[PDB]
Amino acid sequence: EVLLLPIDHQPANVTTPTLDFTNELTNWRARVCELMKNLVDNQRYQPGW
């Protein structure tokens, strides 16, 4: 009766969805972007730009 899935699945609270950012994929995208922000911010890799 049970089904396996790679990602956490919280059910819908409401039947009228609307955008918020409180999930794992947005957190993933934000931390990846944060590391590339650090990667461009480091003074050893490029000040050259």
Return residues touching other proteins (CB under 8 A). 22, 27, 30
Beta carbon nearer to other proteins, 13 or 22 = 22
Beta carbon nearer to other proteins, 22 or 43 = 22
* Rounded-to-5 percentages of helix, strand, coil across the chain: 35, 0, 65
Residue with the two structure tokens 């050893």:
44
We find the least distance from the C-beta atom of residue 32 to other proteins, in angstroms, to be 13
45 neighbors 39 (Cβ within 8 angstroms): yes
We find the least distance from the C-beta atom of residue 41 to other proteins, in angstroms, to be 17
